Amino acid sequence: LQPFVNLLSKATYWWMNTLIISAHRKPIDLKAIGKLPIAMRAVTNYVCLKEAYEEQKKKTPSIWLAMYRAFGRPILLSSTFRYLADLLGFAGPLCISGIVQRKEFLENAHVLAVLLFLALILQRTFLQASYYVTIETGINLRGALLAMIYNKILRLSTSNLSMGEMTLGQINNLVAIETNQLMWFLFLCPNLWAMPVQIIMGVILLYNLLGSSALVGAAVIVLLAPIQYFIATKLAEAQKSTLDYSTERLKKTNEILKGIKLLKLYAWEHIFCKSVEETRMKELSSLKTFALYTSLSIFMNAAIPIAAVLATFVTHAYASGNNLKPAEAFASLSLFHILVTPLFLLSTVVRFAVKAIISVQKLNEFLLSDEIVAIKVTNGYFSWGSGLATLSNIDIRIPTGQLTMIVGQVGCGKSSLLLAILGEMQTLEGKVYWNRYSVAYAAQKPWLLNATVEENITFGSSFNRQRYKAVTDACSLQPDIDLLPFGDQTEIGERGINLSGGQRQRICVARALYQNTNIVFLDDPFSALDIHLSDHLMQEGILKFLQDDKRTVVLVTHKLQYLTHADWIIAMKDGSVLREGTLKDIQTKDVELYEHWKTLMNRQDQTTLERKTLRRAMYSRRLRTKMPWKTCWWYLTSGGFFLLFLMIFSKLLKHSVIVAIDYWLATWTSEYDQTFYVAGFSILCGAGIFLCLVTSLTVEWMGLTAAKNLHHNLLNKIILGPIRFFDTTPLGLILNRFSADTNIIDQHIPPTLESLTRSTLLCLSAIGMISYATPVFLIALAPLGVAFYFIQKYFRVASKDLQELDDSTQLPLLCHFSETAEGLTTIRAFRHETRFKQRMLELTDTNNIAYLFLSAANRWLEVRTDYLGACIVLTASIASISGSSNSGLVGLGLLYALTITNYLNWVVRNLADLEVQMGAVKKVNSFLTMESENYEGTMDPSQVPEHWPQEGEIKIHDLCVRYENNLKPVLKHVKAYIKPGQKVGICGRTGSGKSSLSLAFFRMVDIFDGKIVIDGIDISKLPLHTLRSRLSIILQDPILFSGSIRFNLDPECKCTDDRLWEALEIAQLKNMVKSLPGGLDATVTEGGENFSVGQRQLFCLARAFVRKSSILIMDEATASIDMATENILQKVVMTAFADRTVVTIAHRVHTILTADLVIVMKRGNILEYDTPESLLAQEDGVFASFVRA
């Protein structure tokens, strides 16, 4: 008997109840979820799919055939279940038919009720079994496809001809969209055959029950599918347009957030906010058409059935000598309700099928793509697939266990030489011998995972504290490591703590040196290394650390230095080897080349600067079940009480009119001329259509209004927020507040809310109507209501947890595919292919199990609610037949009871989804409630002179500065009197609050004690906007936002182009802009990458000049600037700003030695404030010490 109960559980999902029930006590952890059965592990599915694919290739290969060969049987089983389920589900109307017309005891009207109950249960259990089988096969297919494309990625080539700039984009698209769409098509595949059969059977049954008259209604409903497909295509068009505008808006917002401090300093936040508001306006303009089409689709879906009913019944009434019977009428109405959904969804199935065909074509295109004495090579010719040997006559030899160096000119091919020796490119002729063992490789372009530093260093190697410390010290990486927030175990790479090129390549070199292997390749590890660091790495790392290990080291470096240490040297030229040998060998054979090295060698602070920027970033650092009804009400009200009332009233009236239509039909059928009834029915149907249209339009209007209001208010509040907000909160979350949350509010909330309200109203109306026909039904209803409440609670909590876990598991998979897509050369050099493949299998298995359990929970909820609906139908039917009432009311009760089962689960599912989305709404609403700054100014703007800062007098009175309240004041008792028309120099030990002093000048940081006085007006006693408007500033790293040169010079557009030209001339940038096309109107890319760093500084100086601040502040402007550019900067500061007041945060003292006066800072203390010449001649203080060095 055990098999019977086992199958029952596998059908009623009894295994899901323990996880779902426990969902309350503990969040659904990955461990809590049992691992995938070996029958469903991604590895096995990949094996089967590869077998099928190779069988196809044995006879150009097509994926579709392989997918069939792999997963046909589950699909056939699913189709069998689906066909049986639909065939049984056609029993509903037939049973209603026979019960209303109430040894062939089937007419007894009692046995038929239990027959209907059992048939409904069997139908729905089979249908859910089919859903689950197709879900499982689809997820298996997704796992197999991901594994297959991952293997392809691992075997991909790196030729620039093949792997273009868009190759990584294509791979991300495949993993994120194409595979998912193919999975969805696999989910929906059974429908593609179960829908047309269902529709045909429905039409045949309609003809049998109601005769040729029902043909009109059949045609009217069949017209639903083309309409749905057309409006769906238009909707997709509008959605693409909205996606384009949304991407533009997101780019603008992201650039704004990054460097927000700069915008606040320039006081330009308002103009950027206005531009983003314009972008949002266009986005909303497109979203309005999207909403129009969505509303049209909903209206058609909810009205075409009414039109079909109207046409059918009017035609039958006017074209039948026999008056309309009740049983036939209600059976036909139930059949229409059965057929509406399949027709409404066949169009979506077709769209998914087309998208899947496109996706499979794209995946096939991807797959059919190109792919690939320690060492000696003889007669080696290699190319990058161009057909022309990029390397020729490769007679290289790599002596075992000895340092080897490769020298050459720019773009000689040494990097290509290493790649070819790795076998990473086609070998036209010649062979390479290994005497393959894995080789430690540090790519010319450094590469890093998204794991922490420890993972990068180990890279899967067993941890050894001794080796880790030794290599870290050898590469001088310990300090910068300590600078990190968590030191080690600190995420780095694209998503983690951003690192400069020097640090990245140092980490890569550390990885290479740590990894235990006999062969090490270092491709110019000194790309951005200072002399001291490079020398330390060479002496301690390259030689000693590997001398002990007796490794074989091949080094590629432009810097001819250190060649003395190298045992063997290689000379290359134009993708060919001039000579190979030691220094003595080259000297003997090629004197000219030997001397040429000395000739070039004889004709010969970034690291410290880099760490300073890194250290600056480090300065800053029960019942999870109840939905947020407060937040949902806040959202609903956001649109406006008028719109909310209109929506509610319209929907209530629509459902009242629909139930009125049904009751009118019942009363009409009561009898057993018809003009009165038909006229009434027609007017009712017209009113219903009108109300459907009105309610759809109203819900969409409410959605649009709410989205616009919420987004606008959020952007205003965030932009008007204090700097600390962005300093603490990671930029990622703030950006996500507009990336996803806004997308959800725009697109998901309105449709989901409309569906939830419609389902709730339909369920309530059905219950009320069956009670009206069957007053005794409520007694049986109440326990069912209790069960419904419990199911609602459990499923809502479980689904929330499962969905969140699914997303958290998915994100690492995309991250890993993106990472492995890059650095393929590095992985293949380490030959860690197996490790990464296993990692991918683990990640995909976890994601698949999460998704599968989410779908299984959905199935469990469906089965429970469906047994509930079956009990409802049984009780309603039995009570009605037993109860004495008019036949029409009996038919109405049976019809509504049968229907209620379709919506009884949609109500709860939409409720859960709306809860999840209200989560995001709460996120946004809470985020926009953050307190703003004291923009109000105590003094009247008129009282403060318009040209207030012209004089340039500044005083400091015992100032104290604190970044945040309750923290130690970085500045204390800071007093300073800066004479107008004076130059002020500031220098001291790093971290002495110089930039803090500048921020205090700009009010950015709180002035807890003391004051800053300019022109006799306290800075605090003034609007911060006014202060920032008429003050200049030159940050250390200038940033320019995407747009024209005019926009950067003056977003306010207040000054004439003559002023801009004069500013660019004085800033020495007039010729630079003139040479570039477009002149003043030339475009600029985001972040100022279009121009050189010195040009960015010139742009900043031009901004200062045009601002006419009368003041000037420089925060180590010369830092990270070319010496000639630094001299130009000094000249322009000295001459152009002669009449202005200059305050400089001197990165280097000698640049500010000429300042009229200097200030010495130390731990928030003004140790010295005099002329720099006097301080040097007075005492040998701190200023004298660092300035002398």
Ligand X SMILES: Nc1ncnc2c1ncn2[C@@H]1O[C@H](COP(=O)(O)OP(=O)(O)OP(=O)(O)O)[C@@H](O)[C@H]1O
Ligand Y SMILES: CCOc1cc(CC(=O)N[C@@H](CC(C)C)c2ccccc2N2CCCCC2)ccc1C(=O)O
Locate breaks in the chain with C to N over 2.5 A; list the residue preceding each. 59, 102, 372, 435, 604, 621, 672
Structure tokens at 880: 């009605």
Least spacing, CB of residue 502 vs ligand X, in Å: 17
Site for ligand Y in 176-215 (CB under 6 A): 187-188, 191
Shortest approach of Mg ion to residue 1150 CB, angstroms? 19
Which one of residues 408, 430, 1038, 1094 is an interface residue with ligand X (CB under 6 A)? 408
Q: Name which of 225 and 406 has its Cβ closer to ligand X.
A: 406
Q: Which does 345 bind (CB under 5 to 8 A by kind): ligand X, Mg ion, ligand Y, none?
A: ligand Y
Of 295, 332, 995, 1151, the residue at the interface with Mg ion (CB under 5 A) is: 995
Residue 412 annotated as lining a ligand binding site:
yes
* Dihedral angle, C-alpha 259, 262, 268, 274, nearest 10 °: 10
Q: How many angstroms separate the CA atoms of 591 and 576, rounded? A: 19
Q: How far apart are CA 145 and CA 153, in angstroms?
A: 12
Q: Are 532 and 840 in contact (CB under 8 A)?
A: no
1183 binds, among ligand X, ligand Y, Mg ion, none (CB under 5 to 8 A by kind): none
Phi, psi of 886 (to 5 degrees): -65, 150
User: Alpha-carbon distance 983 to 1155, whole Å?
Assistant: 5
Is the Cβ–Cβ distance between 481 and 533 less than 8 Å?
no
Query: Is 588 assigned to a binding site?
Result: no
Residue 1121, token pair as written in the block = 């600037």
Asked if residue 992 binds ligand X (CB under 6 A), the reply is yes
Q: By CB under 6 A, name the one of 345, 428, 560, 644 that touches ligand Y.
A: 345
Is 586 an interacting residue with respect to ligand Y (CB under 6 A)?
A: no
* Contact call for residue 611 and ligand X (CB under 6 A): no
Give 81 or 1001: the residue with its C-beta nearer to ligand Y.
81
Three-state secondary-structure class, residue 41: coil
The entry of ligand X, ligand Y, Mg ion, none near residue 855 (CB within 5 to 8 angstroms by kind) is ligand Y
Write out the binding residues for ligand X, residues 349-388 only, by CB under 6 A.
384
995 annotated to bind ligand: yes
- 992 interacts with, out of ligand Y, ligand X, Mg ion, none, CB within 5 to 8 A per kind: ligand X
Helix (H) or strand (E) holding 295: helix 269-318
Residue 491, interface with ligand X (CB under 6 A)?
Answer: no
Site for ligand Y in 27-46 (CB under 6 A): none
Mark residues 613-642: x for contact with ligand X by CB under 6 A, - for none.
Answer: ---x--xx----------------------
998 counts as binding Mg ion under rule CB under 5 A: no
Residue closer to ligand Y by CB (options 188, 375) is: 188
Residues 947-986 interacting with ligand X (rule: CB under 6 A): 963, 970
Element (H, E) at 1006: strand 1006-1014
Query: Judged by CB under 6 A, does residue 656 bind ligand Y?
Result: no
CA–CA distances in Å: residue 230 to residues 294, 305, 829, 1061? 12, 18, 53, 55
Residue (375 or 684) nearer to ligand X, CB: 375
**496 three-state secondary structure:** coil
Which of 438, 444, 582, 885: binder of Mg ion (CB under 5 A)? 444
Comparing CB distances to ligand Y, the nearer of 140 and 426 is 140
Half-sphere CA count of 680, side-chain side, radius 13 A: 14
The nearest distance, CB 345 to ligand Y, in angstroms, is 4
List 242, 901, 995, 1032, residue binding ligand X (CB under 6 A) = 995
Number of residues that bind ligand X (CB under 6 A): 28
Which residues in the 145-204 window bind ligand X by CB under 6 A?
158-160
Q: Residue 670: which of ligand X, Mg ion, ligand Y, none does it interact with, CB under 5 to 8 A by kind?
A: none
Which segment (441-449, 672-680, 739-747, 1100-1108) binds Mg ion by CB under 5 A? 441-449
Give 1129's contacts (C-beta < 8 A, 6+ positions apart).
Answer: 1097, 1101, 1117, 1118, 1121
Phi, psi of 29 (to 5 degrees): -85, 160
Tell me whether residue 414 is annotated as binding.
Answer: yes
User: 3-class DSSP state for residue 253?
Assistant: helix
| One-letter amino acid for residue 1048 of the chain | N
Helix runs in 582-640, H state only: 583-589, 591-602, 606-617, 629-639
- Which C-beta is closer to ligand Y: that of 480 or that of 866? 866
Residue 421 to residue 418: CA distance in whole angstroms? 5
DSSP state of 452: B
Please give the residue whose beta carbon sits closest to ligand Y in the complex. 345
For residues 620 and 446, give the distance between their C-alpha atoms in angstroms, rounded to a whole number: 28
Pick between residue 198 and residue 1068 the one whose CB is nearest to ligand Y. 198
Binding residue (CB under 6 A) for ligand X from 993, 1010, 1038, 1051: 993
837 binds ligand X (CB under 6 A): no
- The residues facing 1143 across adjacent strands are 984, 1113
Task: Decide which of ligand X, ligand Y, Mg ion, none touches 159; Cβ closer than 5 to 8 Å per partner kind.
Answer: ligand X
Torsion of CA 823, 826, 831, 837, to 10 degrees: -20
Instruction: Pick between residue 108 and residue 160 the one whose CB is nearest to ligand X.
Output: 160
Q: How far is the CB of 731 from ligand Y (least distance, A)?
A: 33
Residues 48, 66 contacting (CB under 8 angstroms): no
Phi, psi of 821 (to 5 degrees): -55, -45
990 binds, among ligand X, Mg ion, ligand Y, none (CB under 5 to 8 A by kind): ligand X
Of 131, 268, 366, 927, the one binding ligand Y (CB under 6 A) is 131
- What distance lies between CA 981 and its chain's CA centroid? 52
Supply the DSSP string of 858-873, one letter for each residue.
HHHHHHHHHHHHHHHH
User: Is 989 within any annotated ligand binding site?
Assistant: yes
Out of ligand X, ligand Y, Mg ion, none, what residue 390 binds, judged by CB under 5 to 8 A for its kind, is ligand X
Nearer CB in complex with ligand Y: 483/908: 908
Give per-residue burial for 701-717: e unless 16+ CB within 10 Å, then b: bbbbebbbebbbebbeb
- Residue 633 has a CB neighbour count (10 Å cut-off) of 12
Q: What are phi and psi of 361, to 5 degrees?
A: -60, -45
Helix segments in 37-165, DSSP class H: 42-58, 63-89, 91-101, 111-155
Tell me: is residue 993 an annotated ligand-binding position: yes
Query: What are the Cα distances from residue 93, in Å, to 195, 347, 646, 1076?
Result: 18, 25, 36, 76
Among 179, 334, 747, 858, binds ligand Y (CB under 6 A): 858
CA angle (1056, 1057, 1059) in 5-degree steps: 70
**Burial (CB count <10 Å: 0-12, 13-18, 19+), residue 679:** exposed
Exactly one of 228, 312, 552, 855 binds ligand Y (CB under 6 A); which one? 855
Q: For residues 187 and 788, which CB has a smaller minimum distance to ligand Y in the complex?
A: 187
User: Which lies closer to ligand X via its Cβ, residue 413 or residue 1088?
Assistant: 413
Residues 1085 and 1092: their CA atoms lie apart, in Å, by 12
Tell me if 415 is assigned to a ligand binding site. yes
* Per CB under 6 A, 644 contacts ligand Y: no
Pick the closer one to ligand X by CB: 163 or 762: 163
Cross-strand partners of 960? 1009
Q: Which of residues 727-756 bind ligand X (CB under 6 A)?
A: 727
- Residue closer to ligand X by CB (options 463, 619) is 619
Comparing CB distances to ligand X, the nearer of 801 and 1168 is 1168
Q: How many residues bind Mg ion (CB under 5 A)?
A: 3
Is residue 613 part of the contact set for Mg ion (CB under 5 A)?
no
Number of helices (H) and strands (E) in the chain: give both, helices first.
Answer: 44, 21
DSSP 8-class letter at 543 = I
Residues of this chain that interact with ligand Y (CB under 6 A) are 131, 135, 187-188, 191, 341, 345, 348-349, 855, 858
Residues near ligand X (CB under 6 A) are: 158-160, 384, 390, 408, 410-416, 444, 612, 616, 619-620, 727, 963, 970, 990-996
Residues that bind Mg ion (CB under 5 A): 415, 444, 995
Binding region = 408-415, 988-995
- Residues in binding site for ATP: 408-415, 988-995
